[PDB]
């Protein structure tokens, strides 16, 4: 139980905290792609 280990743990936690924001950005982009594809699928289904 040394300050070095606590600093390592806190830096890992902060890195994960940033990475979760990055994952949120990626998931939002994939959601936008999926919605854009689904609109076209809906129009194709109506035409069919």
């Amino acid at each position: 139980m040394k300050r070095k280990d606590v600093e390592e743990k806190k830096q890992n936690l902060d890195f994960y905290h940033n990475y979760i924001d990055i994952s949120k950005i990626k998931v939002l982009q994939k959601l936008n792609e999926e919605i854009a594809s689904l609109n076209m699928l809906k129009l194709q289904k109506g035409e069919s």
């Binding site: 890992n12 994960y16 990475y19 979760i20 994952s23």
Partner: protein, 498 residues
């Protein structure tokens, strides 16, 4: 026959020449003033006293003046008062050693501990504290380690090989499995050893010593083993001398009879603890964490006598206790410097059910060299440890970010790591009482083959649960095949019924 070149010499016959009486008392520490003496008193000599025919020995620690000394008791102090008469031969404590010690259970000062009638042990008087050799250079004529013992335990045989003629240590907290591993090593080493064995219990349970003595009687290796027991119920003065007496007995059996000695010490932390208590009772300035100033010197004074010469080998297997699971403890740091092989036990692994609870990511062995093993063994061990480290790193990512964040490589790495971790567990022969699973003995090449097969990814289809507590990988394959066959037969039967 065998011609000793540095044999032990029995003590010199003497008459009581120093006389005095106790002028200060305390718990375990007494001050003696000398009235009559034909010679000046020396450090570490023994003063004897008698109370109702019971003999009490006190070792000298400090010499304040020409007539005043401080002492600590070796044994029970019940009976000592102010004015008790004490006499001394100006010699340190001695025990009777001979070939008749094998099969006998004694304590550090030679009290009989295996029968009530106290059957005497014949031999000569040797002083464990007094070590005699021609010169300092004579201490540097030692043989190099050139062999590795096989234990039958997969993890120890593969990742942490145990030297022959060296020192191995088993470190861990309370109740993690040090004594079980020591007993398994005793079972797997004695009765096949070209020599004798010496066990030294230092501040351990009485029940464990009784169990080990009974097991030695039952399995037939009692007559090849010498037992010394200063246990946790004894005074600090006795727990401080158990290791010295055990080392002296091993040195007698090596130097004087040319035999290879298997030395087991448990627990080697209690020696340091007793020395610390004695130092605290003599009112000396403590070191860090309240230890004695002479901690490293005290550890070295015992550890340096366990050496291998041309007369024979002394192989030491020692259990080290970690107080409060603190591996930065000064005693642990002092002990780390002497172990050729270090095996560190984990409480979390034991909680998960991994047995033996050996942490390969914290342990190390100096026998993993090209001088002692083959290239293939080194490569397999390095790959295993690397895979376990990578798996441990990836488990945090799995725990926090979920499982789908990993790639295909990371998932395969985790699967291989889990299979490797659960394959290293093994049922111990001595551990049949705890569960009932029969013990297994796996030789080195079978362990290497199994680990190579698991590393290659051949068994990723078999569920992890099958890998725990087996012998060779063929047992895992057989269990998987039988379970699949039973499932297939049940499915065929139910489809026939429908």
């Amino acid at each position: 026959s065998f011609n000793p070149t540095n044999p032990l010499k029995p003590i010199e016959e003497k008459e009581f020449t120093i006389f005095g009486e106790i002028v200060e008392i305390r718990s375990q520490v007494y001050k003696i003033r000398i009235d009559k003496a034909e010679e000046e008193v020396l450090p570490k000599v023994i003063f004897y006293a008698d109370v109702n025919g019971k003999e009490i020995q006190l070792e000298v620690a400090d010499i304040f003046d020409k007539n005043l000394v401080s002492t600590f008791v070796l044994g029970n102090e019940t009976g000592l008062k102010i004015g008790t008469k004490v006499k001394s031969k100006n010699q340190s404590y001695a025990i009777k050693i001979s070939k008749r010690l094998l099969g006998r259970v004694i304590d550090p000062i030679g009290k009989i501990l295996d029968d009530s009638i106290a059957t005497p042990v014949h031999g000569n008087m040797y002083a464990p504290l007094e070590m005699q050799h021609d010169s300092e250079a004579t201490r540097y004529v030692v043989s190099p380690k050139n062999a590795i013992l096989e234990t039958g335990i997969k993890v120890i045989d593969v990742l942490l090989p145990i030297p022959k003629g060296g020192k191995t240590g088993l470190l861990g907290g309370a109740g993690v499995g040090k004594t079980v591993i020591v007993q398994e090593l005793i079972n797997a080493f004695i009765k096949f050893h070209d020599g004798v064995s010496v066990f030294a219990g230092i501040g351990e349970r009485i029940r464990e010593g009784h169990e080990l003595w009974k097991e030695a009687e039952a399995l037939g290796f009692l007559n090849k083993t010498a037992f010394i027991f200063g246990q946790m119920n004894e005074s600090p003065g006795l727990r401080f001398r158990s290791g010295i007496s055990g080392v002296k007995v091993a040195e007698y059996f090596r130097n004087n009879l040319g035999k290879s000695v298997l030395l087991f010490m448990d627990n080697i932390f209690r020696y340091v603890q007793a020395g610390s208590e004695i130092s605290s009772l003599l009112e000396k300035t403590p070191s860090a964490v309240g230890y004695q100033p002479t901690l490293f010197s005290e550890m070295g004074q015992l550890q340096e006598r366990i050496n291998s010469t041309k007369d024979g080998d002394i192989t030491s297997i020692q259990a080290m206790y970690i107080p409060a699971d603190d591996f930065t403890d000064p005693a642990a740091v002092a002990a780390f410097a002497h172990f050729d092989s270090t095996i560190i036990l984990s409480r979390q692994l034991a909680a998960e059910g991994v047995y033996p609870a050996i942490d390969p990511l914290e342990s190390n062995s100096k026998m993993l060299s090209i001088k002692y093993t083959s290239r293939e063994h080194l490569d397999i061990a390095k790959k295993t440890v690397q895979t376990l480290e990578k798996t441990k790193t990836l488990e945090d990512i799995i725990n926090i970010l979920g499982f789908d964040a990993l790639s295909e490589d990371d998932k395969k790495v985790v699967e291989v790591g889990r299979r490797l971790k659960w394959f290293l567990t093994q049922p111990f022969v001595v551990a049949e009482k705890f569960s009932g699973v029969p013990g297994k003995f796996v030789r080195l090449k079978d362990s290497l083959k199994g680990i190579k097969t698991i590393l290659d990814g051949d068994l990723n289809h078999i569920p992890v649960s099958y890998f725990s507590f087996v012998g060779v990988v063929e047992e895992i394959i057989e269990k998987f095949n039988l379970d699949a066959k039973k499932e297939a037969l049940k499915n065929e039967l139910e489809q026939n019924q429908k």
